[PDB]
mmCIF file of C-alpha atoms (C1' of nucleotides) in Angstrom:
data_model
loop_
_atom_site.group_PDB
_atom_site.id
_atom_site.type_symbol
_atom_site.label_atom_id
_atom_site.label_comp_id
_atom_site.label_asym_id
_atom_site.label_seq_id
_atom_site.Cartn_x
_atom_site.Cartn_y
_atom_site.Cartn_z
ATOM 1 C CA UNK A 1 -102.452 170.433 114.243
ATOM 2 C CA UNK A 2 -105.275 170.839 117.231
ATOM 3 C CA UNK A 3 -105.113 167.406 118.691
ATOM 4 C CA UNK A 4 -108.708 167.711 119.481
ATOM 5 C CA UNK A 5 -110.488 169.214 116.390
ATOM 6 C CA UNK A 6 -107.553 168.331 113.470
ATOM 7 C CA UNK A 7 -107.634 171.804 112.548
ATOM 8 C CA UNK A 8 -103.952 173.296 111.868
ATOM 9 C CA UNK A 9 -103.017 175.935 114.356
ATOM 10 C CA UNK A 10 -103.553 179.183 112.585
ATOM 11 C CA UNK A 11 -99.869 180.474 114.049
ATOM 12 C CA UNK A 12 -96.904 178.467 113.897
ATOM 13 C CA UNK A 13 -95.631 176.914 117.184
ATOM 14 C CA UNK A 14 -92.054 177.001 117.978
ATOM 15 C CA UNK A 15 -90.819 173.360 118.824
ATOM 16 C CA UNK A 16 -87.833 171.921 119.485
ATOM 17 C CA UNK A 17 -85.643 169.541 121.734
ATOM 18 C CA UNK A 18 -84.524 170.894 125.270
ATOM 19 C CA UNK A 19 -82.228 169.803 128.261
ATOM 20 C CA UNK A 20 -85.317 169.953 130.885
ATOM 21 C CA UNK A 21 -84.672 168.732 134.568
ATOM 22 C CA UNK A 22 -86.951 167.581 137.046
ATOM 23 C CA UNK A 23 -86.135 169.200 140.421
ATOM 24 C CA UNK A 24 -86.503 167.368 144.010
ATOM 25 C CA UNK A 25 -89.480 169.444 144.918
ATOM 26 C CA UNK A 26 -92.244 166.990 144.490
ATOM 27 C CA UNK A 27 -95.483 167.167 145.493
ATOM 28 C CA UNK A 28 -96.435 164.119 147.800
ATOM 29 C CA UNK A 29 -93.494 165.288 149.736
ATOM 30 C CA UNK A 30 -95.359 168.678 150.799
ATOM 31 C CA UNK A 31 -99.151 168.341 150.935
ATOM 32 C CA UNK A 32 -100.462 167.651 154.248
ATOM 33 C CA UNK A 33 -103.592 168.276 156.349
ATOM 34 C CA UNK A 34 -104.888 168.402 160.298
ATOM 35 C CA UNK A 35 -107.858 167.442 162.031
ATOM 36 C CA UNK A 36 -107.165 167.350 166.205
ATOM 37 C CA UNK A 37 -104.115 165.413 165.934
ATOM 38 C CA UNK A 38 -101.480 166.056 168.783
ATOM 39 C CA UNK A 39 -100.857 168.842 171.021
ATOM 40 C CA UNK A 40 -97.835 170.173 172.129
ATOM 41 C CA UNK A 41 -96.782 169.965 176.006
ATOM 42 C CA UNK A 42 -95.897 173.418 177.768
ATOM 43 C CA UNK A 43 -99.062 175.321 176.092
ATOM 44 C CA UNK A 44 -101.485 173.076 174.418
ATOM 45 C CA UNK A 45 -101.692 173.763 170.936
ATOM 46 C CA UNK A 46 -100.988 171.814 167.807
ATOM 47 C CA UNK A 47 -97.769 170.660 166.724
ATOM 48 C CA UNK A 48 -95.472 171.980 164.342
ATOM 49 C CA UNK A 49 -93.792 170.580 161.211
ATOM 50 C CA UNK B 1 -93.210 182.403 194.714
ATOM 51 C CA UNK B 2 -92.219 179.197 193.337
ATOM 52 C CA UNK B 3 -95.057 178.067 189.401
ATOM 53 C CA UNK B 4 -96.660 175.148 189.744
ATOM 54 C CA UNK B 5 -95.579 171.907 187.202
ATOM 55 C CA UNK B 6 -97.594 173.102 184.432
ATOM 56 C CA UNK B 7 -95.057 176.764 184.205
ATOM 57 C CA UNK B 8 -92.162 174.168 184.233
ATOM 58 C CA UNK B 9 -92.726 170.881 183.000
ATOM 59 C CA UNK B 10 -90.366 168.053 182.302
ATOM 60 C CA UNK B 11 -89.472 166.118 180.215
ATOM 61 C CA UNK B 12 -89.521 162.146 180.338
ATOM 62 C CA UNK B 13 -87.187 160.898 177.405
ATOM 63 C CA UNK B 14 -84.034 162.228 175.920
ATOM 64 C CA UNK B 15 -86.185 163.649 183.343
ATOM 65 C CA UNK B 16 -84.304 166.194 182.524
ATOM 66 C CA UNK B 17 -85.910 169.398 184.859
ATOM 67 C CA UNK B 18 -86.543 172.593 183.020
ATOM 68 C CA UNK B 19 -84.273 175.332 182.733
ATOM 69 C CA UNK B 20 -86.375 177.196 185.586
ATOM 70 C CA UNK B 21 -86.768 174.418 188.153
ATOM 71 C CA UNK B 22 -82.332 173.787 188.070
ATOM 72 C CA UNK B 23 -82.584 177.922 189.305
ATOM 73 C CA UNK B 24 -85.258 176.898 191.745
ATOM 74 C CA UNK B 25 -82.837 174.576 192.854
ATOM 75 C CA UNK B 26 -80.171 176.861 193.350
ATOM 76 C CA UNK B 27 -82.341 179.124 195.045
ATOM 77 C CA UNK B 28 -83.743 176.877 197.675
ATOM 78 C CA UNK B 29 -80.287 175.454 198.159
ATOM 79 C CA UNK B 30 -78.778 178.640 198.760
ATOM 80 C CA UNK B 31 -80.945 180.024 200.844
ATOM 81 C CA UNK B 32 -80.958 176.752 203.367
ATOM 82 C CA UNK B 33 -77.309 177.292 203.390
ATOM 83 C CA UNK B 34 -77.866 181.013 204.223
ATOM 84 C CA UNK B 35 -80.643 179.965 207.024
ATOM 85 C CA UNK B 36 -78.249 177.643 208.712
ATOM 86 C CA UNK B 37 -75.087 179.681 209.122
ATOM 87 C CA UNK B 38 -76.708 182.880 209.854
ATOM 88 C CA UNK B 39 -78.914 180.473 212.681
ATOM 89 C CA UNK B 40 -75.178 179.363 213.972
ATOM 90 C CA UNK B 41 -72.442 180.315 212.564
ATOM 91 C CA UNK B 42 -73.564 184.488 212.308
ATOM 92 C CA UNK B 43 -69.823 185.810 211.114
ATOM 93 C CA UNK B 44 -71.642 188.692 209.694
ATOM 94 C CA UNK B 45 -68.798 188.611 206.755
ATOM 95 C CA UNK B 46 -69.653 184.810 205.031
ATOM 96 C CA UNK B 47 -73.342 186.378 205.507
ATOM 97 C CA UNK B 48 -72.367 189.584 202.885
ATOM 98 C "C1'" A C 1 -117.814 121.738 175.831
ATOM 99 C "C1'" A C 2 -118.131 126.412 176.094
ATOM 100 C "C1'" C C 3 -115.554 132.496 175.997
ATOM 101 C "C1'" C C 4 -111.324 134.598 174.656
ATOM 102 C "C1'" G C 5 -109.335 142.403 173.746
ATOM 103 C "C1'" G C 6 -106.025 145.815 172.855
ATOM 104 C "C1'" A C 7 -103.166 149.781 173.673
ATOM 105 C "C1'" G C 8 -100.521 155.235 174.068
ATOM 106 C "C1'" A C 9 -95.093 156.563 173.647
ATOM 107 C "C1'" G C 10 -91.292 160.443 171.475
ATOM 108 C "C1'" G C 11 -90.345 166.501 174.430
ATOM 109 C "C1'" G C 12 -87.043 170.694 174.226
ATOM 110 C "C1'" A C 13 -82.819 173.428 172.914
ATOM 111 C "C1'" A C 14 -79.001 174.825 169.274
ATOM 112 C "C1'" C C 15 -77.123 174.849 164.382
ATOM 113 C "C1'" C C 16 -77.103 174.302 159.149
ATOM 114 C "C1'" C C 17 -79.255 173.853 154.448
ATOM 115 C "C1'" A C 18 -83.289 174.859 151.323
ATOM 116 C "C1'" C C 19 -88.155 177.043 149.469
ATOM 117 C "C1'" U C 20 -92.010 181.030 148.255
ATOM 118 C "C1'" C C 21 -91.706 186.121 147.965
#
RNA sequence: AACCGGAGAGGGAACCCACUC
């Protein structure tokens, strides 16, 4: 059934219990941004990492 | 001619010199060594 | 009865693992 509306799905939905895991990938551990932080030493352009 | 400290910076924490002031080194050293005994010593082989 | 702030240090080399194709 449409959660939103009540109306039953015209097709059928196949459903069912499966072994899912959740891999270490997250996404807090990856976004990041940059706005004249540090500079590196030798020639003076930003950081890496 | 010898780059200024900017070329070859170093470092302060772990100064360890760069990798191109240690051949500075060398070269200075060397050539002293080669001023002095050719000044004196002159054996014309330890000069080769 | 009488002033009362304030910074500055982390760099490089090498290796390994992993990710998106």
């Amino acid at each position: 059934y449409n959660g939103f509306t009540g109306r039953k799905i015209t097709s059928q939905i196949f459903i069912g219990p499966t072994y899912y895991q959740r891999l270490k990938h997250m996404v807090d551990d990856k976004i990041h941004s940059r706005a004249r932080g540090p500079i590196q030493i030798l020639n003076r352009q930003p950081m890496e990492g | 001619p010898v780059p200024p400290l900017s070329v070859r910076p170093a470092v302060v924490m772990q100064r360890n010199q760069d990798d191109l002031t240690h051949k500075l080194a060398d070269i200075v050293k060397i050539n002293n060594q080669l001023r002095r005994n050719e000044q004196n010593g002159a054996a014309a082989h330890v000069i080769a």
